[PDB]
Structure formats: C-alpha cells, structure tokens
C-alpha cells in the first residue's frame, strides 16, 4: 500500500472531531530504541462522549506543499453500516 493507516480512536479530541489515532513510528520489536509505534490522527466525542472511538481508518498524509485533506473509507467497529 502507498500510504494511509487506520485504527485507534475514531474519536479522541483535537479541535477536529472524529478520526482515529494509531501509536506513531515503525515499531520494530521493542528492544529500547524509543520507537513511538506507528501513527495517530485527531478526532473528538461524536456523541455518547465517544471516548476512543475504537478502530476506524483514513490517512491524511503529512502536508508536502498544498495537500491537507486525508484518505480513508472509514471503519471503527463491526455492526453499524
């Protein structure tokens, strides 16, 4: 796959509202090279106070000149569309 990602949250808070999150950095084994662990992306409480939407999806690659929109198709939990 070129880029993108998906997962964590779907909510989270970040003056944005909705999205996901998903750690930050490659991940390797864990040894002790810091890491961070894959990535992460805004969100909020989309009703019910959300609280970590769960595992959705999208993308929103880093801006490289004139591109701030993101990619996706959605996700977050089974049973709901």
From Swiss-Prot:
Gene Ontology cellular component list: cytosolic small ribosomal subunit
GO molecular function: rRNA binding; structural constituent of ribosome
A Pfam family hit: Ribosomal_S17
CDD domains: Ribosomal_uS17 (cd00364)
Family annotation (InterPro entries): NA-bd_OB-fold (IPR012340), Ribosomal_uS17 (IPR000266), Ribosomal_uS17_bact/chlr (IPR019984), Ribosomal_uS17_CS (IPR019979)
This protein's UniProt keywords: Ribonucleoprotein, Ribosomal protein, RNA-binding, rRNA-binding
GO terms, biological process: translation
Origin: domain of life: Bacteria
Role: One of the primary rRNA binding proteins, it binds specifically to the 5'-end of 16S ribosomal RNA.
Subunit structure: Part of the 30S ribosomal subunit.
UniProt record similarity statement: Belongs to the universal ribosomal protein uS17 family.
Name under which the protein is recorded: Small ribosomal subunit protein uS17
Organism: Geobacillus stearothermophilus
Lineage: Bacteria, Bacillati, Bacillota, Bacilli, Bacillales
This protein's encoding gene: rpsQ
């Amino acid at each position: 796959q070129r880029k993108v990602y998906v997962g964590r949250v779907v909510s989270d808070k970040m003056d944005k509202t909705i999205t996901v999150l998903v750690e930050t950095y490659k991940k390797h084994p864990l040894y002790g090279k810091r890491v961070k662990y894959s990535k992460k992306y805004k969100a909020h409480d989309e009703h019910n106070e959300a609280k970590v939407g769960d595992i959705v999806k999208i993308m929103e690659t880093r801006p490289l000149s004139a591109t701030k929109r993101f990619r996706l198709v959605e996700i977050v939990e089974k049973a709901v569309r």
